[PDB]
From Swiss-Prot, chain A:
GO biological process, one term: mitochondrial electron transport, NADH to ubiquinone
Keywords annotated in UniProt: 4Fe-4S, Electron transport, Iron, Iron-sulfur, Membrane, Metal-binding, Mitochondrion, Mitochondrion inner membrane, NAD, Oxidoreductase, Repeat, Respiratory chain, Transit peptide, Translocase, Transport, Ubiquinone
Predominant location category: mitochondrion
Role of this protein: Core subunit of the mitochondrial membrane respiratory chain NADH dehydrogenase (Complex I) which catalyzes electron transfer from NADH through the respiratory chain, using ubiquinone as an electron acceptor. Essential for the catalytic activity and assembly of complex I.
Catalytic activity entry: a ubiquinone + NADH + 5 H(+)(in) = a ubiquinol + NAD(+) + 4 H(+)(out)
UniProt-recorded name of the protein: NADH dehydrogenase [ubiquinone] iron-sulfur protein 8, mitochondrial
Quaternary data: Core subunit of respiratory chain NADH dehydrogenase (Complex I) which is composed of 45 different subunits. This is a component of the iron-sulfur (IP) fragment of the enzyme. Interacts with RAB5IF.
GO cellular component, one term: mitochondrial inner membrane
Localization of this protein: Mitochondrion inner membrane
Obligatory cofactor(s): [4Fe-4S] cluster
E.C. number: 7.1.1.2
Membrane-related topology note: Peripheral membrane protein
From-to range in the entire protein, with total length: 96 to 212 of 212
Cofactor: how bound: Binds 2 [4Fe-4S] clusters per subunit.
Swiss-Prot record, chain B:
Assembly and binders: Core subunit of respiratory chain NADH dehydrogenase (Complex I) which is composed of 45 different subunits. Component of the iron-sulfur (IP) fragment of the enzyme. Interacts with NDUFAF3. Interacts with NDUFAF7. Interacts with CERS2.
Compartment(s): Mitochondrion inner membrane
Originating organism: Bos taurus (Bovine)
The name this protein goes by in its record: NADH dehydrogenase [ubiquinone] iron-sulfur protein 2, mitochondrial
Residues making up the signal peptide according to the UniProt record: none
Binding site for [4Fe-4S] cluster: C23, C29, C44
Annotated family: Belongs to the complex I 49 kDa subunit family.
Protein role: Core subunit of the mitochondrial membrane respiratory chain NADH dehydrogenase (Complex I) which catalyzes electron transfer from NADH through the respiratory chain, using ubiquinone as an electron acceptor. Essential for the catalytic activity and assembly of complex I. Redox-sensitive, critical component of the oxygen-sensing pathway in the pulmonary vasculature which plays a key role in acute pulmonary oxygen-sensing and hypoxic pulmonary vasoconstriction. Plays an important role in carotid body sensing of hypoxia.
Curated annotation (Swiss-Prot), chain D:
Binding sites annotated in the UniProt record for [4Fe-4S] cluster 2: C146, C149, C152, C196
Residue range from the parent sequence: 31 to 232 of 727
Domain 4Fe-4S His(Cys)3-ligated-type as annotated: residue spans: 78-117
Function: Core subunit of the mitochondrial membrane respiratory chain NADH dehydrogenase (Complex I) which catalyzes electron transfer from NADH through the respiratory chain, using ubiquinone as an electron acceptor. Essential for catalysing the entry and efficient transfer of electrons within complex I. Plays a key role in the assembly and stability of complex I and participates in the association of complex I with ubiquinol-cytochrome reductase complex (Complex III) to form supercomplexes.
Entry protein name: NADH-ubiquinone oxidoreductase 75 kDa subunit, mitochondrial
Sites where the protein binds [4Fe-4S] cluster 1: H94, C98, C101, C107
Domain 2Fe-2S ferredoxin-type, residue spans: 1-78
Top-rank taxon, per record: Eukaryota
Binding partners and assembly: Core subunit of respiratory chain NADH dehydrogenase (Complex I) which is composed of 45 different subunits. This is the largest subunit of complex I and it is a component of the iron-sulfur (IP) fragment of the enzyme. Complex I associates with ubiquinol-cytochrome reductase complex (Complex III) to form supercomplexes. Interacts with MDM2 and AKAP1.
Organism: Bos taurus
Subcellular compartments: Mitochondrion inner membrane
Coiled-coil region(s): none
Residues that bind [2Fe-2S] cluster: C34, C45, C48, C62
Family: Belongs to the complex I 75 kDa subunit family.
Swiss-Prot record, chain G:
Range of the intact protein held here: 46 to 152 of 266
Subcellular location as annotated: Mitochondrion inner membrane
The protein's name in its UniProt record: NADH dehydrogenase [ubiquinone] iron-sulfur protein 3, mitochondrial
Top-level taxonomy: Eukaryota, Metazoa, Chordata, Craniata, Vertebrata
Role played: Core subunit of the mitochondrial membrane respiratory chain NADH dehydrogenase (Complex I) which catalyzes electron transfer from NADH through the respiratory chain, using ubiquinone as an electron acceptor. Essential for the catalytic activity and assembly of complex I.
Domain of life: Eukaryota
Subunit structure of this chain's protein: Core subunit of respiratory chain NADH dehydrogenase (Complex I) which is composed of 45 different subunits. Interacts with NDUFAF3. Interacts with RAB5IF. Found in subcomplexes containing subunits NDUFS2, MT-ND1 and NDUFA13.
Organism: Bos taurus (Bovine)
Gene name as annotated: NDUFS3
Length: 117, 107, 186, 234, 89, 425, 107
């Protein structure tokens, strides 16, 4: 269990695991995470705006803890270096969804997380 | 020794006190604190009762992750201990626990 | 199912009694003259006796005669257990399974009836003749087994006597009260 | 007017005043589910149970009036044992929607568990689910989230005019729906979503758009439709 | 699906005649792989035996609070609040 | 001081031969003109002086309940209410008081008509018992047309009309508040009991709720002497009540017996299964469905009277024997009693709709044996809670028998859990 | 209670003696309001004389405080008088914590 760069996880059979609650929004002590939600096509209601600032965020794992569906899981990350603030602050999911390269490690790390240690 | 915080006086403590108020004797006591600190850590390893990690009352601390997913009241309290705070009793309180630098007099 | 109602082939077509229409109007006069909603509880029982399987549109027509709310009158028959919900046969019988009857074997009477008259327990006959349903209490608990068919309740029956009464009921009515012993004291 | 002391402090009340109405004068709010503002007084929950100074059984605040000079305690030993119990009964058959649910902080039942109900544990196994009721334009109704009370039932009968909501079953299967497949009329029935305490009836136009947490409220009179004043906009 | 140059992901618009988007020109813009929720419908619906069924992701290990789903209507299968998985009978 | 069983004394004796005129020869409407000529205050005093307890499953006295209304000044016209439908399972009073002798039940409404001061009398019968309901309707046609009750009959100024209505067959006939709502036309749900009883407001009128056996005793108490009704029984509770035995027995039969009678003597006369209390294990309940099952040790000391039954475990209110043999299952039997309340729950008070349905689901696990040994003690706290925080008396009726599992027993429940713990796990 | 209660009241009556002792002097110049809750003592002081209150508790035969260590201030716009300067005092010889407050608007 180590906290680095944020990445949101998904279910084994497709589907975005984040349900849009604004739960992690209010717990966030830096107010780095922003969420505005709209209905997805028909029936399902899962996110639209999802920005996490790296200009902010003091790294707590609070958003990992407050999440009932376990969407934001903190992966073992170190590599992050940019030329601008714009390149540094995370956009509407997308780059957070691009955490698939770290989601293989996250799935292994969460197996040591259920029933804590 | 005077004011216990969380299970004190039960653990054996040694406090170094010098004689002269110079920088050298004020340095010696800090090293004497360090040699007489492992005694506490060893006694912490000796005395460990297995049980609860958080407060069982779910108006202060959020419940377990396996617990919240099944039962109802757990997740509603999880929803309200996050976002909304604690709902604290009103009153002014002062606490000071020994810092190695001095004190953290939170008011 | 209790809340949901089907819209296919049982939602628009409904018929009301014409010969018993004069008798239904007299039943409303039995209660209070001004503000009479008591007739809706009486007409709901009269509709099931006259026409088999009450329709959703038929309840709305019955509510219009007494002049009441269509949603409130539909909810009034939902709480009742005696009124038919979906479909009923020519002679529908309900078996008692409560503890005053279960103490002297009640499940044995239901299991023997299930094999003799076919089907499991909840499912009715495909030819529409006899329908089985679990009942809370028949009313009269004087006899150890109790089963109410159509209107008259048949009490006190053996393992072979219950099967003999059921097969005979297919062509001619079997009457009966407690055909096993004295009615009052034995 | 007859005066009767509630929590030792004396408060003057009318002869036909309710127990919860008398509690408002002493500046104390009892746990509610069936309204006291405009909706008709009805039981059918037994949450607002209060214990008198000398009584074997607790009486409901909505139904029972004060009448005679009798002492009633809000923070009594019997009342706290009651309030924690009734909350557990309400949540034994509750579908668990809290993160997905349209309400969250605005939900009255959500606050009462935190304030009154038992926190440490809730004994429950296997909860029944109800099928989704038909609704037209406003309020995307979910029958599962509903606690089965009498608030919206009387709202259609008295406040709105046209009656639709009622009872459908007997046990833990009775739905608050219309039973017959028909869309709800407009007129003034759009306010039914705001009336319900649970996250069962909530506006479909602004569903899951914003939670009760993090929303700045401001009061302003509505421009559309005359004689409209005081409407909070988030 | 992609409009002109930029690809849409999880319902997003690129630019109206190129005015807002200018930063994503030298550097390539991000895109989530299979964000159209095609994998949600790809999963086969499971048959139910009881009137109400409980849903779970994978026990207490995977984050899924227990929700009971009712099956009464024949048309349109019922799905849980967290999953896109549908149940029949 | 000791009470003897019956001994040529019964409230209703005719059951074999009765129609309309045949009942009249065997004590029926003997002092019909005498009671009608007497004042309302003097007629109500006759029931109070005798001290007759309520026949219905409540425990409230019949003398105080009838005098509770009184009617000093009335705006809206008063109406009389009577319940005849079967409420609690194991009771045979529904198909005996109206089915066997319909003339006695119709005379009860006329005797209480002038006493209470009601314009019209109403009776509610069970929907499942259609044959018994037909006998009551036939008696009304033989009374109104001939000249027994209606407008001016037997030298009376006060007018009373009898009308019978078919019921749904649920909790609507159960509670006193429920009968007023069911007869009005609304859905089967009881009104709020704390602020207004039957006397203050019932179907837009001052009314009174009465049992089928309670109403039938009123003309018998009026025609005969006041001391005759108070002769059999105890000092606190007096009056003969119909007791029915159902379940594990040599011959199941309903018979009228005197108050304050031992359980061993009553079971021996009707003949039970194996033994009265020596060979077969005692699991008999004093009530129909309300009261929990009596222990094997204390059974001979227990009396039929409500005042004596309250001293041990719980008081008998419905007065019906539900005996179970040693071979028959105890765990499965009581679980079925709670399952009755699962179907007969109306759907109002939240610790009952989502209470009893929660209670039955836990109780079904005890039959299988998947329940934990710790879960027995936890269930006792919930069962006690439902008794207090409910509007109607059916909430209490589901609460009491579950309390009789933790009390008296407990090793019987623990053995079922221990058996599945080793075999399956 | 086992986990629900932090500490039972035993020294509360002992600390209440200080709530009487300083109040036995009874100055309108000094005393005013004395509040005692959760093993702690709180005193608010009239603006006219703050120095004479601080010379007291310093030295003194009955109680020796000496250290007038930590000093806070409260901003509150509810009252007609705005600010509330709060003194947190600690004793080394006596081992007790007492509070000194000011009630004035102090603009
Ligand atoms: C579960 C239950 C079922 C009952 N069923 C009936 C019934 O069917 N008929 C009846 O007259 N009383 C019944 N009672 C008794 C009622 O409380 C009754 O309305 C009244 O209070 C008793 O007074 P009475 O003897 O004058 O009717 C029942 C009570 C309970 C707890
Ligand atoms: S990350 Fe978790 S808590 Fe935050 S909105 Fe998504 S599902 Fe809700
Ligand atoms: S780690 Fe902390 S600061 Fe960063 S997004 Fe999560 S809650 Fe906010
Ligand atoms: S109704 Fe209230 S308590 Fe229930 S899931 Fe919705 S927000 Fe949570
Ligand atoms: S929808 Fe809301 S107001 Fe209506 S019955 Fe259910 S909980 Fe009560
Ligand atoms: S206790 Fe149960 S049956 Fe009685 S009124 Fe309340 S919900 Fe209905
Ligand atoms: S809140 Fe008073 S009865 Fe429901
Ligand atoms: S309990 Fe079976 S007939 Fe009454
Ligand atoms: Zn799911």
């Amino acid at each position: 269990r180590f906290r680095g760069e944020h990445a949101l996880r998904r279910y084994p059979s497709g589907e975005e695991r984040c349900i849009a609650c604004k739960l992690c929004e209010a717990v966030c002590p830096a107010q780095a995470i922003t969420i505005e939600a709209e209905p997805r096509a028909d029936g399902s209601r899962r996110t639209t705006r999802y920005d996490i600032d790296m200009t902010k965020c003091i790294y707590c794992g609070f958003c990992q803890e407050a999440c009932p569906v376990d969407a934001i899981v903190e992966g073992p990350n170190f590599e992050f270096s940019t030329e601008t603030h714009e390149e540094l602050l995370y956009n509407k999911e997308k780059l957070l969804n691009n955490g698939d390269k770290w989601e293989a490690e996250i799935a292994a790390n969460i197996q040591a997380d259920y029933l804590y240690r | 020794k005077t004011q216990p915080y969380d299970v004190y006086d039960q653990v054996e403590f040694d406090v170094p006190i010098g004689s002269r108020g110079d920088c050298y004797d004020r340095y010696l006591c800090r090293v004497e604190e360090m040699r007489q600190s492992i005694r506490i850590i060893s006694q912490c390893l000796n005395k460990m009762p297995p049980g609860e990690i958080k407060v069982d009352d779910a108006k202060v601390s959020p419940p377990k992750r396996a617990e919240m997913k099944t039962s109802m009241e757990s997740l509603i309290h999880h929803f309200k201990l996050y976002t909304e705070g604690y709902q604290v009793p009103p009153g002014a309180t002062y606490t000071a626990i020994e810092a190695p630098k001095g004190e953290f007099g939170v008011y | 199912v209790h809340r949901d109602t089907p819209e296919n082939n049982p939602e628009t077509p409904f018929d009301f009694t014409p010969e018993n229409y004069k008798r239904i109007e007299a039943i409303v006069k039995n209660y209070p003259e001004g503000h009479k909603a008591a007739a809706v509880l009486p007409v709901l029982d009269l509709a099931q006796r006259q026409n088999g399987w009450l329709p959703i549109s038929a309840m709305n027509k019955v509510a219009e005669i007494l002049q009441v709310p269509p949603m409130r009158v539909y909810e009034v028959a939902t709480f009742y257990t005696m009124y038919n919900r979906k479909p009923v046969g020519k002679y529908h019988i309900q078996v008692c399974t409560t503890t005053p009857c279960m103490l002297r074997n009640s499940d044995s009477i239901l299991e023997a009836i299930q094999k003799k008259l076919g089907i499991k327990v909840g499912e009715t006959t495909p030819d529409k003749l006899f329908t089985l349903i679990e009942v809370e209490c028949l009313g009269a608990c004087v006899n150890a087994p109790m089963v109410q068919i159509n209107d008259n309740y048949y009490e006190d029956l053996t393992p072979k006597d219950i099967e003999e009464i059921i097969d005979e009921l297919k062509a001619g009515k079997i009457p009966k009260p407690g055909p096993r012993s004295g009615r009052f004291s034995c | 007017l007859i005066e009767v002391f509630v929590d030792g402090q004396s408060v003057m009340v009318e002869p036909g005043t309710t127990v919860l109405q008398a509690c408002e004068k002493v500046g104390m709010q009892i746990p509610r589910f069936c309204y006291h503002e405009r909706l008709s007084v009805a039981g059918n929950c037994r949450m607002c149970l209060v214990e008198i100074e000398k009584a074997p059984k607790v009486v409901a605040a909505c139904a029972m009036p004060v009448m005679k000079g009798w002492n009633i305690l809000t923070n009594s030993e019997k009342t706290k044992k009651a309030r924690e119990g009734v909350m557990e009964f309400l949540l034994a058959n509750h579908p668990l929607d809290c993160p997905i649910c349209d309400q969250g902080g605005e939900c009255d039942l959500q606050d009462q568990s935190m304030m009154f109900g038992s926190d440490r544990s809730r004994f429950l196994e296997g909860k029944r689910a109800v099928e989704d009721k038909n609704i037209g334009p406003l309020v995307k109704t979910i029958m599962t989230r509903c606690i089965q009370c009498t608030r919206c039932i009387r709202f259609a009968s008295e406040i709105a005019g046209v009656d639709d909501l009622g009872t459908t079953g007997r046990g833990n299967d009775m739905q608050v729906g219309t039973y017959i497949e028909k869309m709800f009329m407009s007129e003034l029935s759009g306010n039914i979503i705001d009336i319900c305490p649970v996250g069962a009836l909530t506006x479909x136009x602004x569903x899951x758009x914003x939670x009760x947490x993090x929303x700045x409220x401001x009061x302003x009179x509505x421009x559309x439709x005359x004689x409209x004043x005081x409407x909070x906009x988030x | 699906x992609x409009x002109x140059x930029x690809x849409x992901x999880x319902x997003x618009x690129x630019x109206x005649x190129x005015x807002x988007x200018x930063x994503x020109x030298x550097x390539x813009x991000x895109x989530x792989x299979x964000x159209x929720x095609x994998x949600x419908x790809x999963x086969x619906x499971x048959x139910x035996x009881x009137x109400x069924x409980x849903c779970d992701g994978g026990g207490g290990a995977l984050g899924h609070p227990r929700v009971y789903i009712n099956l009464d209507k024949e048309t349109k299968t019922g799905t849980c609040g967290y999953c896109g998985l549908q149940f029949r009978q | 001081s000791l009470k003897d069983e019956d001994r040529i004394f019964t409230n209703l004796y005719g059951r074999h031969d009765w129609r309309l005129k045949g009942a009249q020869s065997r004590g029926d409407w003997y002092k019909t003109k005498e009671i009608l000529l007497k004042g309302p205050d003097w007629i109500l005093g006759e029931v109070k002086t005798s001290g007759l307890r309520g026949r219905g499953g409540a425990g409230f006295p019949t003398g105080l309940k009838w005098s509770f209304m009184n009617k000093p000044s009335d705006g809206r016209p008063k109406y009389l209410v009577v319940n005849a439908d079967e409420g609690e399972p194991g009771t045979c009073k529904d198909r005996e008081i109206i089915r066997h002798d319909p003339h006695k039940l119709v005379e009860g409404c006329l005797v209480g008509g002038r006493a209470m001061g009601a314009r019209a009398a109403y009776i509610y019968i069970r929907g499942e018992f259609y044959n018994e309901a037909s006998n009551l309707q036939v008696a009304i046609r033989e009374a109104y047309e001939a000249g027994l009750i209606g407008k001016n009959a037997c030298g009376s100024g006060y007018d009373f009309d009898v009308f019978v209505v078919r019921g749904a067959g649920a909790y609507i006939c159960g509670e006193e508040t429920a009968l007023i709502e069911s007869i009005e036309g609304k859905q089967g749900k009881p009104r709020l009991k704390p602020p207004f009883p039957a006397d203050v407001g019932v179907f837009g009128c001052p009314t009174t709720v009465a049992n089928v056996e309670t109403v039938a005793v009123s003309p018998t108490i009026c025609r005969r002497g006041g001391a005759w009704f108070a002769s059999f029984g105890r000092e606190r509770n007096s009056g003969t009540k119909l007791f029915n035995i159902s379940g594990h027995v040599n011959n199941p039969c309903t018979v009228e017996e005197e108050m304050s009678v031992p359980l061993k003597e009553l079971i021996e006369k009707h003949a039970g299964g194996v033994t009265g209390g020596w060979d077969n294990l005692l699991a008999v309940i004093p009530g129909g469905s309300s009261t929990p099952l009596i222990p094997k040790s204390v059974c001979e000391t227990v009396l039929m009277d409500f005042d004596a039954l309250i001293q041990a475990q719980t008081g008998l209110g419905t007065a019906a024997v539900i005996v179970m043999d040693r071979s028959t299952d105890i765990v499965k039997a009581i679980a079925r009693l709670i399952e009755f309340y699962k179907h007969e729950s109306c759907g109002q008070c939240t610790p009952c709709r989502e209470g009893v349905d929660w209670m039955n689901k836990v109780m079904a696990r005890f039959v299988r044996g998947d329940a934990r040994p710790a879960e027995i003690d936890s269930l006792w706290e919930i069962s006690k809670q439902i008794e207090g925080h409910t509007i109607c008396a059916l909430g209490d009726g589901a609460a009491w028998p579950v309390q009789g599992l933790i009390r008296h027993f407990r090793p019987e429940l623990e053995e079922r859990m221990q058996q599945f713990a080793q075999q399956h796990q | 209670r086992p986990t629900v209660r932090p500490r039972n009241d035993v020294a509360h009556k002992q600390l209440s003696a200080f709530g009487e002792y300083v109040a036995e002097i009874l100055p309108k110049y000094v005393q005013q309001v004395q509040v005692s809750c959760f093993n702690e003592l709180e005193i608010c002081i009239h603006p006219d004389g703050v120095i004479p209150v601080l010379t007291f508790l310093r030295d003194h035969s009955n109680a020796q405080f000496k250290s007038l260590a930590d000093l806070t201030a409260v901003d509150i716009p509810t009252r007609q008088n705005r600010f509330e300067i709060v003194y947190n005092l600690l004793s080394l010889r006596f081992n007790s914590r007492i509070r000194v407050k000011t009630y004035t608007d102090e603009l």
